[PDB]
C-alpha cells in the first residue's frame, strides 16, 4: 500500500545507517557480552590502565601523557573531542542520505545538524554503554563509569548523565533498524530555534514518524507502545544537551589550560 513506501524508507535509512556508522548496536552488544570472537576491548578503570591503553584508544593527540604537561582529565576530555568530531561527520553523511534533507535551505540544513548532532551522539552512545562503562575507539576500548566519575570536577560530571539516560533508553531494547529511523526523526525537528522554513521539515518528519511507527509495530509485534515512550525520550535528549552545554560553559571559564575543537565551537555558538 502506502505502507510499502514506508518499508522502502526504513530499508534505505537502515542501509545508509550501516554505511555511515562504523560500530552498530548489534556489534557493540556482542562485544559487551563477549559473544564475539574478536580481541576483547582494553579496560580503562584507573590512571595506570589509561597510560597503558593510550595507544590502542587513539587518545594520543600529539605526545604521550608522561611527556606532555596536560593532566589525565584534560587528555580524556580532548580524546572524547576527536571522537565527537568524527561522530558529527558520520551523522552529517547520514543526514544527507535522508530523502529531502539536501533539498532543504542550506541554512536550515546547518540549524537541524547544529541542534540535532549531540542528541544523536547521546542516542548512539547508549548503544555503546551499560551500567558499568562505555565502548570507545570503535569497540577496542572499554572505559568504566567509576573511572569517569573519579575524574576531578567538573570533568567527573560530563559522562554520568549520559550513563543515566542510556540505562533507561537501553530498556526499550531498540535494534539498529529502529534507531536508523529514530535518529532521522530527531534530525528533522521542526521546533529548532532559527529555522527559516519549518513546513518541508515537518513534511519530511511526518514521513519518518509514520515509517518509525510501522517499523516499531513490525519489529516488536510482541511489544505495544514504545512509539509514545520513544517520543518522550526526545525531550530527555534535549535536557542532556542543555545540561552538557552548561558544563562546557563552566570549563570554558574554570580551565584556560584547553580550547574546544573548531567544529564543536561552530556547533555550541548560540546554543541554549
Amino acid at each position: 500500500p502506502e505502507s510499502a513506501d514506508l518499508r522502502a524508507l526504513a530499508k534505505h535509512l537502515y542501509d545508509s545507517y550501516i554505511k555511515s556508522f562504523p560500530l552498530t548496536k548489534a556489534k557493540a552488544r556482542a562485544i559487551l557480552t563477549g559473544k564475539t570472537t574478536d580481541k576483547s576491548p582494553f579496560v580503562i578503570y584507573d590512571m595506570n590502565s589509561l597510560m597503558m591503553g593510550e595507544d590502542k584508544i587513539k587518545f594520543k593527540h600529539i605526545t604521550p601523557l608522561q611527556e606532555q604537561s596536560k593532566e589525565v582529565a584534560i587528555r580524556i576530555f580532548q580524546g572524547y573531542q576527536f571522537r565527537s568530531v568524527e561522530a558529527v561527520q558520520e551523522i552529517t553523511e547520514y543526514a544527507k542520505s535522508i530523502p529531502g534533507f539536501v533539498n532543504l535551505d542550506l541554512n536550515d540544513q546547518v540549524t537541524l545538524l547544529k541542534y540535532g548532532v549531540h542528541e544523536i551522539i547521546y542516542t548512539m552512545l547508549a548503544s555503546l554503554m551499560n551500567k558499568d562503562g562505555v565502548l570507545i575507539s570503535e569497540g577496542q576500548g572499554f572505559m568504566t563509569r567509576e573511572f569517569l566519575k573519579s575524574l576531578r570536577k567538573p570533568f567527573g560530571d560530563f559522562m554520568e548523565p549520559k550513563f543515566e539516560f542510556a540505562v533507561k533508553f537501553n530498556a526499550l531494547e531498540l535494534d539498529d533498524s529502529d534507531l536508523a529511523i529514530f535518529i532521522a526523526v530527531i534530525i528533522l525537528s521542526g521546533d529548532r530555534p532559527g529555522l527559516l522554513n519549518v513546513k518541508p521539515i515537518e513534511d519530511i518528519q511526518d514521513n519518518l514518524l509514520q515509517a518509525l511507527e510501522l517499523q516499531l509495530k513490525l519489529n516488536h509485534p510482541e511489544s505495544s507502545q514504545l512509539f509514545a515512550k520513544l517520543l518522550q525520550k526526545m525531550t530527555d535528549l534535549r535536557q542532556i544537551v542543555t545540561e552538557h552545554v552548561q558544563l562546557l560553559q563552566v570549563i570554558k571559564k574554570t580551565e584556560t589550560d584547553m580550547s574546544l575543537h573548531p567544529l564543536l565551537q561552530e556547533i555550541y555558538k548560540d546554543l541554549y
Binding site: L106, K114, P262, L263
Partner: peptide, 11 residues
C-alpha cells in the same frame, strides 16, 4: 558562520 558545517554538507 558555520564554515566547517557548510563544508561537511557541501561535500
Amino acid at each position: 558562520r558555520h564554515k566547517i558545517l557548510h563544508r561537511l554538507l557541501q561535500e
